[PDB]
Structures are given as structure tokens and as C-alpha cells.
Amino acid sequence: LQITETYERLRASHISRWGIVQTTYPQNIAEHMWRVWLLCRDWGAAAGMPQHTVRQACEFALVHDLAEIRTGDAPTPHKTPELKELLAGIEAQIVPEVAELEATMAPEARELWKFCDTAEAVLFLKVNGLGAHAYDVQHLLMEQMKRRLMDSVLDVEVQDELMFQFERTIKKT
Amino acid sequence: LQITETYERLRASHISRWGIVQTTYPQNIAEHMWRVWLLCRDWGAAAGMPQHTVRQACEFALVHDLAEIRTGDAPTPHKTPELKELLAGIEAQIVPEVAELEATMAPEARELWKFCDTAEAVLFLKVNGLGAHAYDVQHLLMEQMKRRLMDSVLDVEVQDELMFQFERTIKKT
Amino acid sequence: LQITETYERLRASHISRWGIVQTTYPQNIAEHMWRVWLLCRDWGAAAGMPQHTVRQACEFALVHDLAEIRTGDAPTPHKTPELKELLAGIEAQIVPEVAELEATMAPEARELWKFCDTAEAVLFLKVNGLGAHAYDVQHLLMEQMKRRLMDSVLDVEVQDELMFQFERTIKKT
Amino acid sequence: LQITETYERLRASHISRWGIVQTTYPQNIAEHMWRVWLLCRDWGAAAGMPQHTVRQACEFALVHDLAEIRTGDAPTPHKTPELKELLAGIEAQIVPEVAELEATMAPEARELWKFCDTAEAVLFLKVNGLGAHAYDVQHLLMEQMKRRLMDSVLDVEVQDELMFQFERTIKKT
Amino acid sequence: LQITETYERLRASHISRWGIVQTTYPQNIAEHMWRVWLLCRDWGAAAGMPQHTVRQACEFALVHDLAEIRTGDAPTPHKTPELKELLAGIEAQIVPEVAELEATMAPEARELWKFCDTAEAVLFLKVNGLGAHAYDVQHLLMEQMKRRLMDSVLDVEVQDELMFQFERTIKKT
Amino acid sequence: LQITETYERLRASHISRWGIVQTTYPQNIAEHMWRVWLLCRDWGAAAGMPQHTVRQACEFALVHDLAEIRTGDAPTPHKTPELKELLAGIEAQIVPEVAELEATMAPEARELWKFCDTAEAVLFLKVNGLGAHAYDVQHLLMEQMKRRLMDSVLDVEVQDELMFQFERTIKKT
Numbered sequence A, B, C, D, E, F: 001l002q003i004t005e006t007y008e009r010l011r012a013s014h015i016s017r018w019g020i021v022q023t024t025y026p027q028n029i030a031e032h033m034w035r036v037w038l039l040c041r042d043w044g045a046a047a048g049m050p051q052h053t054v055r056q057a058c059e060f061a062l063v064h065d066l067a068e069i070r071t072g073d074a075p076t077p078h079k080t081p082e083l084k085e086l087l088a089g090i091e092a093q094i095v096p097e098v099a100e101l102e103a104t105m106a107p108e109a110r111e112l113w114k115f116c117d118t119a120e121a122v123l124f125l126k127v128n129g130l131g132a133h134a135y136d137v138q139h140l141l142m143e144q145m146k147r148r149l150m151d152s153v154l155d156v157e158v159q160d161e162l163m164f165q166f167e168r169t170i171k172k173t
């Protein structure tokens, strides 16, 4: 069950996202993690977040979905509380080092990472989603991203900077 | 959670299979279910199985993976006993009519269906799998298909006919 | 010429549709037949059509385009009366069992099947068609679907139910 | 029916080949015609064929499959003598200018063109064909290409040069 | 460095265009050159250009991007004056025969070819471009195509015919 | 010319690699950079390289090909000494921050990064390359990777560990 080899970790590029949504091509978790890392780096710096917080979010962004090399990438609505608790233990066996980073992550770094994880999905579907259901998922994810940020421990000024950067970015995507 | 609309059921063609395996293109559950239905029809008749048993397996084959319109298509190794029990209840809420057909299916029809469900995957990867991991998965699925058939309630003569047809088919695929 | 083997019938997933229309990906006849079957099942029941009529349309839907494993999937405008008469005889040699089902099909089951065969194409292009010509073909097929239904032997109440379901479905596709 | 506009002729790149054969991607008739033209140019010159003969074959190669913008690209085995006679008249209405070039083509230019038309298909499948059926079609086309060349009006020395170039080319493709 | 073999020239279909722009699929230089040739042929004749000028533009269109079999297809904005001078010498070593045709091309044939080379790209992106950046590139290329034509040695009447045909074509693409 | 915006950096996933080589799909520079980063992290640690050296190679791996968002991804054989000198200055204007990291990189970190940059390409083509030319490029890149490592400043023990890990990885890819 545990992922221990580089040949297995390289299969991040063989893991297809958007399993229940029509898209122009099958996006993999490697390109997703690189783009989430990029957003953490750029938007964490734009929001004036502490260097240690941005570094922690970037480090997590690069490996955060590695358990999907075994589990597959399940659609967010499927992950109900009872399923997520079972998945938490399974993912801890698959990628113990990722579980350790997750357990150490400061709340501010977690909120920067989660904002970027969701923003990357909205930005991806803006270009590559096909059809009414994909349109609805893109808009639902944007609504969820905003609500989570608004209710987060991030300072209002930081939330505003993140939304300022997100809106500017999606307009040119 | 429950699937109630034709526009949702049509999304069987938007559900991508092989979420953790490299393939030439993203196969969807609609083409998979049609091919499993075809194998149940042809191989059930070739094995001289009772018409009622073949009909039951074909009817189940056409809708068996419909819950994946909500859950996504998780890789078989991920479905451990504890996860499968949680998934059974969730899938019963998603597609109650499919759960009812599954609960009514006779053991012989279930074994014909399962043999065809797995054979379709091996046949698909024979043409469309890419790389060492896909090669291993194709061979593991074939080994699992054979072991399940060998330990099933199907008569030895029926198991032999099914293996006779499977081997002839894969050689020309 | 005759299709006699399961390895040949499995090639329904190797037969590409939309040979002269730009699309996001090459849809195959297996996913098409599964979706047409689904529409016959759901919309035949929604329209309150007799169970025997719905069953006949569903049975035909699952195999109706199998001759295309040999002929290829020719674009509808190409099939003029003189060509269709030649193709009828060729297809009868390729898939005699499909020709027998076609010859037995009741007019009401044929009209439910044809409405669903065309509706599936319009629904597919709504999501996956690319460009002006694909847009025109999607709209021409919808116009043809409506005209055929309006001039059919189906009761006005059944035609209205089918159009009610079609419009609701395409709006969410 | 007649193709009269540049926007229609540009749809050569929207016409998918290999309608009944599994391939890595959908090759269009525009890339096919360019490659057939290239083979006529290079191999006609390598075989020392008269400049007028090579020019005629190249000119035909560039437009030879244009009627498929309306008809679709039917698989060669489907084109039986009776169907080909009906298709000849239909294609003459679709592309009268292509029909005129075909009617004027000298036997030697026709044989250079046909050798290149078939060789391009074998070369394409060598790289992009997937599965047993595609393998068989690639080998059947090569056998047909050789038999037609061997029975043609081309001088033995020209046939040998064409086969010499074909074998060298496929080895490095 | 020099391209000398037919197996290398056949790789025109392995050279992907739009290296920095999101598209529905990877268009190759073979389909591009065929479409540019088609536009030169049709639009050169529609504009009443001399037969020798149209022939020269068509001949160049068919081979003009062959050096990209070695260089790759670099995005137009990247080709600054200093880089283009270095590339001119490299391309002359790669495809000496293409360099000779380019050096012989009359200004009017060059302007017909360049108008068609750019128009083909705008027409391609109209159907197959994805996202804001692809939209901007499509519109920038159209602006560049118009400005170059307006400042060219072509007679105003010829420029008007070319724009008349371009606008009619894109409206139906 | 300079890349200054996150919406531009996100286009790493719109930059297609392998511009002159046939592949199963168009790999982008984002998935490439993530995989190169992964190889630097895992193989740098496996080789017992100093933590500061591994960190420097990983940091460079994540952004090393960002200038290709403007330049496109040119094939390695095209980058001759004279072209590389011109490209060095252009890339310094496009991504000044990447140029600064490159200028600061220690020789050992550069050799770990370059080994991983090339190994990722060989591993990618092992699964996704199509045809004779792609096969030759995969083998040429492996030969180049080995020769550069053998002539590098890395200790023989480190070179042996890197080759030990590379061979184990490719066997299971």
C-alpha cells in the first residue's frame, strides 16, 4: 500500500483528474500540483504573507495529492465526512511523509494552499471544461473557494489581496 | 445525492475509467458498459447458460457502474473491505434501482457478469494500455478473472467455455 | 463480410462517429448505442409507452449501428435513397440478426428509437461539437428530429412528452 | 451537393480517416493528401519517371480525396464494385474538377499515385495503429500495394525503385 | 543537419504547431501546409492574380515550413530580427531547395502566400483555440495579416478581393 | 517580453514539449518540471548529496523551463552554440529571476538537475514515444545523459548511485 519508489511517484503524471467532468483533455495531478505550487508562491508573496508560511504552503502544494497515485482522484462532492475519515487513515499509510507535512501545516499556510488548490481547478475549467455540468462545477468551486476564504483565519487584507489576484488572473485565462 | 434525471445518466460518457493507469485515451463507463453487456450476451449464449441467467447478467451489465456518475471510477485495489462496505450504502442511495437489481441477481448471472466486467478491462488494456504499470495491471486483472471463475459456482464445463472464448477473443484483439 | 465473432463486435468501440464534423474527441458507436438505449428506456417510460414497445426500441438501440464495424459510419446527408437501398442489402449480409430485429420492429418502437438516435447526436454535439459547421449540423439534426416526430404515428401526447423531456435534458447538457 | 466554397474545402482537416480502425489519434484527409503528394514527388523522381507523369500524380494527390468532405472516408473493403460505381457518379457531382483530373490521368501517373496513396496508409499505421486488427490492416494494405504494383503497366525497373524506396522509408518510420 | 530523406520529410505530420497556445488538438505542419496551399490556389484565382504568380505561391506553400522538421515550430513573437537572421542561415542548410524557392519568389506571390499562411492560422484558432490567450493570438494574427496586406505591393483591388474572401470564409468556419 | 504575471506563468501547462517527435499526447512543461523536481528530490537524497545541493537543484527544477512560455520548447539538437548564446540573453530578459538562480547554481546541483532533466525525457518517451524516430531520440538522450554524468564533477560513487536509481526506475516505467 505505501508508496516507496520514485517509479511510483513519477506516476503522478498518469493520475487523471476530473473523473466525472467532461474536459478537453485529461489533466494529471503532476501539472495540477505544479500550478498549485506556483499560485502559492506568487499569491502568498503578493499578499505579503510571512516567508515561512509561503514556504510551508509551497512545500505541501508539491506533494499534497500524491496518495491519488493509489486511491485515484475522487470528485470533491463524493468526499463526505464519514468517507473522509476513512480516507485520512488510508492516505496516512500510502504517503506517511505527506501526512506528516499536513499535520504540521500552520492554519494560515493551509488556507493559502486550499485557496490555491481550488483556484487552480476553477482556472483549469475556465479554459478546458466542456458543457453545462462542467460550467456549474466551475462556478460551484469558485463559490466554495470564496466562502472558505471569507470564513478563514486569514486577515481581511490578505483575503482581499488573494481575491484581487484571483480575479485579475481568471480574467486573462 | 440520488441520480434521478436522464441528463445525469447521459453523463455515463463523461465518467473516465483508468484513473491511475496510463492509456491511449480516456475510456468512459458508457462504452465499458456496452462492451460488458456484449460479452455477457455472446459468452453467456456460447456457454449454453440458461436464457434467464444471461438476460439477468445483460440487464445488470448495462447499468452496473452508473453510481460512478457521482462517485467517480475508483481503481479496484483501492476498494478494500472496509471501504467497500461504506461505498455499498452510498451507491444504494445514488442508484437505488441498480442496488435492487444487484440484490436480486442469481449467483450464476453474477459470475457471468463479473467475468465479463474483468475480461472487458483486460481486452481494453491489451490495445490501449501504455507502459510497464499498465502491462502489470492487465496481467493482474487476467489472473484475478481466472481465479474468481475457477472458484465460482459455475459448472467446470461453463468455466471452460468462457475461458475458451476469452482466449480466442484476446488473441484477435 | 458477415460479422460472426465477439472480437469483431467488441470493435464497436473502434468505430468513430462524426467522420466529417469537427469534434473535441472521436466518439465511438459503443458509447453512442449505450446512450441511445438509455434515452429509449427513460423517455419511453416517461412518455407512458407500452412496456413491449419500449423493450423493442431498447433491444434495437443496443445493436442498431453494428454493421458500421464493416461499413464505417457514413454521414446522414450522404445516405440518399439510391445509396440506402444498396446499403440495406449489404448491412443485411453483415448483421443478419440486426436486419431481423429491424424488420420486426413496430412503427411506434421505430419512432421512439429514431427520436433517441437523433437526440443523442444533438446532445453530443451540444457539448463536443467545434466550429460553425458543427453548430449548423447540431441545429439541422434537431430540426429533422422534430419534423420526423411531428409527422410520426406517435400520439400527440407522446410527442409532447418526448419533446418536453428532450428540451429539459439539452438545457442541462 | 457540389463543393464550391473555400470554407468547405478547408474542412479537409475536419475529415477523419480510419473510421473502423483503432489509432493513436484521428488522422485527417489534409495531412494524408500532403503526405501522398510528398511521396509522389520524391518517389516519382527517385524512380526516374518523366517530369510530366510525376507532375500529374502530384496534382491529383493534393485533391484526390476531396469528395470525402461530403461522403466521409469509407474503409477500402466496404467499396465493392457495385458500391464504387454508385460512388463514382456521386463524387463526380461533389468535385467535378477532381473527376476531370481523374479522367485525364495517364496510367503511369495513376499507378505512382495509387502506390503512394497506399504506402502512406501503411506508413501511418506503422506508427499510429493500435491492436491486432490495425496490425492486420497494415499488413493487408502492404500486400495489396505490392500486388497492384507488380501487376501494373510500370516498367520492372520503376517498380523495383519504388519498392526499394518504400522499404528504406518504412524501416526508418 | 540537411534533410535529405523521404522518411524525414514524412515527419512533417509529427511537427506540432502552436507550441505556446492552448488548442483542442496538436495541429501538424503537414495539415497546415495543405490548407495554406488550398488558400493560395482558391484565393489567388478569386483575386484574378496571374497564373504564374498563383503557381509560385502554391509551390512554396507546400514546402515552406519543412525546416521545422529539424528546428521545431517557434512562435512568431519569438522570431525577432536578430534571431530571424541566424535562423535564415540554419534553414538554408536544412532545406536548401526551399531556400532556393524562397529566394526566387516574386513579391506578389510572397504576399499571396503570407496572407494565406496567416489566414490559415486565424481560421484554425477560430475553431480550435482554447482560452483568453488563444483568443488574443487569433485576433492579433488577424490584425497583422490585414496590416501586412494593406502595406503590400498588391493592387488595392486584389487586397479587397482577398479580404472579401477571407471574411466570407471565417464567417462559415 | 518579460514574464511578470501569474496568468502568464500558469501557461506552463499550455507549453507543449516534443515539438518534432511523435508522442501519444502533448506533454506540457508544467508536468515536466514537476517530474524533474521529483527526480532531483528523490535521487539527490538517494545519492547522499548535501541537503543544500539537493535544495538548489529542486528549486531550479521547478522554474528552469519557464522562458518557454514565450520562446516555445525547441528541440535539443537545434540548440547549437551560436543559437544558445543568443537564447541565453533572450531568456535572461524573459525570466530574470530564473537567470539569477541559474547563475548561482553550484556545479554539483547543476549536474544533478541536468541528469534529472534528461532522465525525465527518457522515462517519458519510454511510455509515450511513438515510432522509429521517437525510439532513436529516447536512446540518444539516454546516451547523452550517461556521457554528461560520466564526465561531470560528481564523485564516481554519486554517479553510480544515480545510474543505479535510473536503471531501476526505467525498468518499472
Ligand SMILES: Nc1ncnc2c1ncn2[C@H]1C[C@H](O)[C@@H](CO)O1
Residues within 6 Å of the ligand: A017, A018, A019, A020, A021, A073, A074, A075, A076, A077, A121, A137, A140, A141
Ligand atoms: N463539484 C464537483 N464535481 C465534480 N468534480 C469536482 C467537483 N469539485 C471538484 N471536482 C474534482 C476536481 C478534482 O479532480 C477533484 C478534487 O481533488 O474533484
Ligand SMILES: Nc1ncnc2c1ncn2[C@H]1C[C@H](O)[C@@H](CO)O1
Residues within 6 Å of the ligand: B017, B018, B019, B020, B021, B073, B074, B075, B076, B077, B121, B137, B140, B141
Ligand atoms: N490493479 C489495478 N490498478 C489500477 N486500476 C485498476 C486495477 N484493476 C482495475 N483497475 C481499474 C479499472 C476500472 O477503471 C476500475 C474498476 O472499475 O479500476
Ligand SMILES: Nc1ncnc2c1ncn2[C@H]1C[C@H](O)[C@@H](CO)O1
Residues within 6 Å of the ligand: C017, C018, C019, C020, C021, C073, C074, C075, C076, C077, C121, C137, C140, C141
Ligand atoms: N448533417 C450532418 N452532417 C454531417 N454528419 C452528420 C450529419 N447528420 C448526422 N451526421 C453524422 C452523425 C453520425 O456520425 C452519422 C449518422 O449515423 O452521421
Ligand SMILES: Nc1ncnc2c1ncn2[C@H]1C[C@H](O)[C@@H](CO)O1
Residues within 6 Å of the ligand: D017, D018, D019, D020, D021, D073, D074, D075, D076, D077, D121, D137, D140, D141
Ligand atoms: N482493410 C482495411 N480495413 C479498414 N480500413 C481500411 C482498410 N484499408 C484501408 N482502410 C482505410 C484507410 C482510409 O481511411 C480508407 C481508404 O481511403 O480506408
Ligand SMILES: Nc1ncnc2c1ncn2[C@H]1C[C@H](O)[C@@H](CO)O1
Residues within 6 Å of the ligand: E017, E018, E019, E020, E021, E073, E074, E075, E076, E077, E121, E137, E140, E141
Ligand atoms: N502571437 C502568437 N503567439 C503565439 N503563437 C503564435 C503567435 N502567432 C503565431 N503563432 C504560432 C503559429 C505557428 O505555430 C507559429 C508560426 O509559424 O507560431
Ligand SMILES: Nc1ncnc2c1ncn2[C@H]1C[C@H](O)[C@@H](CO)O1
Residues within 6 Å of the ligand: F017, F018, F019, F020, F021, F073, F074, F075, F076, F077, F121, F137, F140, F141
Ligand atoms: N534528439 C532530440 N530530437 C528531438 N527532440 C528532442 C531531442 N532531444 C530532446 N528533445 C526535446 C525534448 C524537449 O521537448 C526539448 C528539450 O527541452 O527537446
Ligand SMILES: [Co+2]
Residues within 6 Å of the ligand: A065, A068, A073, A074
Ligand atoms: Co483530488
Ligand SMILES: [Co+2]
Residues within 6 Å of the ligand: A032, A036, A064, A065, A117
Ligand atoms: Co489538489
Ligand SMILES: [Co+2]
Residues within 6 Å of the ligand: A161
Ligand atoms: Co495590495
Ligand SMILES: [Co+2]
Residues within 6 Å of the ligand: B065, B068, B073, B074
Ligand atoms: Co469502476
Ligand SMILES: [Co+2]
Residues within 6 Å of the ligand: B032, B036, B064, B065, B117
Ligand atoms: Co464495470
Ligand SMILES: [Co+2]
Residues within 6 Å of the ligand: B161
Ligand atoms: Co463448447
Ligand SMILES: [Co+2]
Residues within 6 Å of the ligand: C065, C068, C073, C074
Ligand atoms: Co451512423
Ligand SMILES: [Co+2]
Residues within 6 Å of the ligand: C032, C036, C064, C065, C117
Ligand atoms: Co445510431
Ligand SMILES: [Co+2]
Residues within 6 Å of the ligand: C161
Ligand atoms: Co407528462
Ligand SMILES: [Co+2]
Residues within 6 Å of the ligand: D065, D068, D073, D074
Ligand atoms: Co478514403
